[PDB]
Structure formats: structure tokens, C-alpha cells
Amino acid sequence: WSTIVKLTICPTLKSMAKKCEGSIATMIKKKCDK
Amino acid sequence: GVIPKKIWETVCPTVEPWAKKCSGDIATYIKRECGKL
């Protein structure tokens, strides 16, 4: 979402996404980038 | 690489919905960061 904050949190969020409930992984990636 | 206290505070609301609706080591980590504040 942000310039700085986005890049900071996002890598961690991806690692989380690997084993989330329902299909939250999708939401994580949507906001973030790679 | 590492994320500071300030960032953890900022992300809190955004990360919240995903966090509880998730599991594993990383989910537990982020939860701890925002919560313990």
C-alpha cells in the first residue's frame, strides 16, 4: 500500500500466507507485490 | 530486513483481519508484534 511500509511488512505477510485460513493468502498478495 | 516497533504499530489494523484468519509461525509472530505494544 505504502512506498516504504508496504515493502517492509509484505515479505513477512507472504510467509504467513503460505498457511492461512480460508483463502486469506490471496488478500495478502493482492495488496502486496513481488 | 527486520521490522521496527514503529512499523508494527502502523500495520496493526491492516494486518489484523488476515492474522487471526491464518496460522503457522509467521501468523503467531505478527500477532505478537502488534499485540505486545
From Swiss-Prot, chain A:
Disulfide bond entries: 10-32
Q: Which InterPro entries match?
A: Ectatomin, Ectatomin_sf
Q: Does the keyword Nuclease apply?
A: no
Q: Where, subcellularly, is it found? A: Secreted; Target cell membrane
Q: Which residues cross the membrane?
A: none
Q: Where does the signal sequence lie? A: none
Instruction: Please give the chief subcellular localization of this protein.
Output: secreted
Tissues expressed in: Expressed by the venom gland.
Arranged from A to Z, the UniProt key words for this protein are:
Calcium channel impairing toxin, Disulfide bond, Ion channel, Ion channel impairing toxin, Ion transport, Membrane, Secreted, Target cell membrane, Target membrane, Toxin, Transport, Voltage-gated calcium channel impairing toxin
Q: Name one GO molecular function term.
A: monoatomic ion channel activity
Q: Check the record and name the Pfam families matching this protein.
A: Ectatomin (PF06457)
Provide the Gene Ontology terms for cellular component: extracellular region; membrane; other organism cell membrane
Subunit field text: Heterodimer of an A and a B chain; disulfide-linked.
**Family under the similarity heading:** Belongs to the ectatomin family. Ectatomin-Et subfamily.
**Protein function:** Algogenic for animals, human and insects. At high concentrations (0.5-1 uM), it acts as a pore-forming protein that forms nonselective cation channels both in cell and artificial membranes. It is weakly selective for cation over anions channel conductance is identical in both directions. At lower concentrations (1-10 nM), this heterodimer inhibits cardiac L-type calcium currents in isolated rat cardiac ventricular myocytes.
- In Swiss-Prot or TrEMBL terms, this protein is called Omega/M-ectatotoxin-Et1a subunit B
Q: Which organism is it from?
A: Ectatomma tuberculatum (Selva ant)
From Swiss-Prot, chain B:
Q: Where in the cell is it found?
A: Secreted; Target cell membrane
Alphabetically list the UniProt keywords. Calcium channel impairing toxin, Disulfide bond, Ion channel, Ion channel impairing toxin, Ion transport, Membrane, Secreted, Target cell membrane, Target membrane, Toxin, Transport, Voltage-gated calcium channel impairing toxin
The GO cellular component terms are: extracellular region; membrane; other organism cell membrane
Pfam families attached to this UniProt entry:
Ectatomin
Reported function = Algogenic for animals, human and insects. At high concentrations (0.5-1 uM), it acts as a pore-forming protein that forms nonselective cation channels both in cell and artificial membranes. It is weakly selective for cation over anions channel conductance is identical in both directions. At lower concentrations (1-10 nM), this heterodimer inhibits cardiac L-type calcium currents in isolated rat cardiac ventricular myocytes.
User: Which top-level group of life is the source organism from?
Assistant: Eukaryota
Spell out the subunit comment.
Answer: Heterodimer of an A and a B chain; disulfide-linked.
What pairs make up the disulfide bonds? 12-34
The family this protein is said to belong to: Belongs to the ectatomin family. Ectatomin-Et subfamily.
Q: Which residues form a coiled coil?
A: none
Protein name (Swiss-Prot/TrEMBL)? Omega/M-ectatotoxin-Et1a subunit A
Tissue expression remark = Expressed by the venom gland.
Instruction: Write down the InterPro entries for this protein, in alphabetical order.
Output: Ectatomin, Ectatomin_sf
Molecular function via GO: calcium channel regulator activity; monoatomic ion channel activity; toxin activity
Statement: the UniProt record of this protein carries the keyword Heme: no
